[PDB]
């Protein structure tokens, strides 16, 4: 066990300990590594490579701007990965490709403007995908294939519409967060999202410290009228 952390079995608790780097003594038997709420600013190239039994990795609440290429590649058992509340400005190509068992991925509250091509394509088992509070300007391509999703968080980005049909195979969704985006309701491309929200009112959620059902929380930029109240005649294909 690392000097400044506490280990109970295969649980290594390094949370809330003002760590400026990943600590040296992490046991090879670790299954849950909790590094939440520290001041870690980078990961060294092969830091997790020996931690082959990891199931859950909490990197929430740190100061990461980037990740080393291949940093998660040896974590073949990983099911849970949180990277929320860092300041990631990009992800390396293929960063999640080896994480075949992942069911939970949290990228909330970073500085992402775009994701690598096909970044989620290998994550066939994903049930929860959270990427609120970034600077995304379009829906990451490939999300439409993630048919086992129950939770999808896209709130508080810079999204203006959703590509036609993108949510149609996501038939297991129970929680979809869409608020806080500048939806472009003047453009006729908004109509798919309008129709989809209106057809799925019970799963669209806002966040009052917790999930709250509210289909009107997806709102039009400028007017702050509900997206589902948009009429086709109020839109034009020449305003896109
Ligand atoms: C690893 C983990 O559980 N992290 C939690 C975050 O995912 C939570 O963020 C909130 O997540 C929901 C979707 O599940 C939604 O995207 C919320 O908008 C999001 O909250 C945002 O981020 C928070 C830190 C606040 O800034 C909030 O005002 C934002 O709207 C947070 C919720 O506190 O808890 C983490 O533990």
Please list every residue in the chain followed by a chain break, i.e. its C lies more than 2.5 Å from the next written N: none
CA of 154 to the centre of ligand 1 (A): 11
**CA distance to 90, 124, 130, per residue, from 187 (Å):** 29, 33, 26
Cα 86 to chain centroid, rounded: 12
E strand segments, 22-164: 32-34, 56-58, 80-82, 104-106, 128-130, 151-153
The token pair at 39 is 């001041």
From 108, 129, 157, mutation site for ligand 1 pocket: most ligand atoms within 8 A of C-beta:
108
3-state secondary structure 161-226: CCCCCCCCCCCCCCEEECCCCCECCCEHHHHHHHHHHHHCHHHEEEECCCEEECHHHCEECCCCCE
Nearest to 215 by CA among 196, 202, 231: 202
Give the integer Cα–Cα distance in Å for 188 and 240. Answer: 7
Q: Whose CA is nearest to atom 34 of ligand 1?
A: 209
Cα 26 to chain centroid, rounded: 27
Question: Based on the structure, what is the number of domains in the chain?
Answer: 1
From 103, 207, 211, 212, mutation site for ligand 1 pocket: most ligand atoms within 8 A of C-beta:
207
Give the integer Cα–Cα distance in Å for 68 and 92. Answer: 7
The token pair at 123 is 């994550």
Give the integer Cα–Cα distance in Å for 62 and 38. Answer: 5
Experimental determination technique = X-ray
Q: Which strands, in side-by-side order, build the sheet including 151-153?
A: 6-7, 11-13, 32-34, 56-58, 80-82, 104-106, 128-130, 151-153, 175-177, 204-207, 211-213
- Number of the ligand 1 atom closest to the C-alpha atom of 36: 1
The continuous run of DSSP H or E covering 6 comes out as strand 6-7
Residue 69 CB neighbour total at 10 angstroms:
11
Ligand 1: which residues within 6 Å by Cβ? 60, 82, 84, 106, 108-109, 130, 132-133, 153, 155, 177, 207
Residue 18 in 3-state DSSP? coil
Nearest to 119 by CA among 199, 205, 229, 136: 136
Q: How many CA atoms lie within 13 A of 109 on its CB side?
A: 10
Q: Which domain holds residue 175?
A: 1-240
Residue 46 CB neighbour total at 10 angstroms:
12
């Amino acid at each position: 066990c690392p000097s400044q952390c506490s280990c109970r079995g295969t649980y290594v608790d390094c949370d809330s300990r003002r760590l400026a780097s990943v600590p040296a003594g992490i046991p090879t038997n670790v299954q849950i590594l909790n590094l939440y709420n520290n001041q870690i600013t980078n990961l060294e190239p092969g830091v997790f490579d020996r931690l082959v039994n990891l199931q859950k990795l909490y990197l929430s609440g740190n100061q990461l701007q980037a990740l080393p290429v291949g940093v998660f590649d040896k974590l073949s058992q990983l099911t849970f990965l949180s990277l929320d509340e860092n300041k990631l400005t990009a992800l390396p190509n293929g960063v999640f490709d080896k994480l075949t068992e992942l069911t939970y991925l949290n990228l909330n509250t970073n500085q992402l403007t775009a994701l690598p091509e096909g970044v989620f394509d290998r994550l066939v088992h994903l049930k929860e995908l959270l990427m609120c509070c970034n600077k995304l300007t379009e829906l990451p391509r490939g999300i439409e294939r993630l048919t086992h999703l129950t939770h999808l968080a896209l709130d508080q980005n810079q999204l203006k519409s959703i590509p036609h049909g993108a949510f149609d195979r996501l038939s297991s969704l129970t929680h979809a967060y869409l608020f806080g985006n500048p939806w472009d309701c003047e453009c006729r491309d908004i109509m798919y999202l309008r129709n989809w929200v209106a057809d799925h009112t019970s799963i669209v959620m806002r966040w009052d410290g917790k999930a709250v059902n509210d289909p009107d929380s997806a709102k039009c930029a400028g007017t702050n009228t509900p997206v589902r109240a948009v009429t086709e005649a109020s839109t034009s294909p020449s305003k896109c």
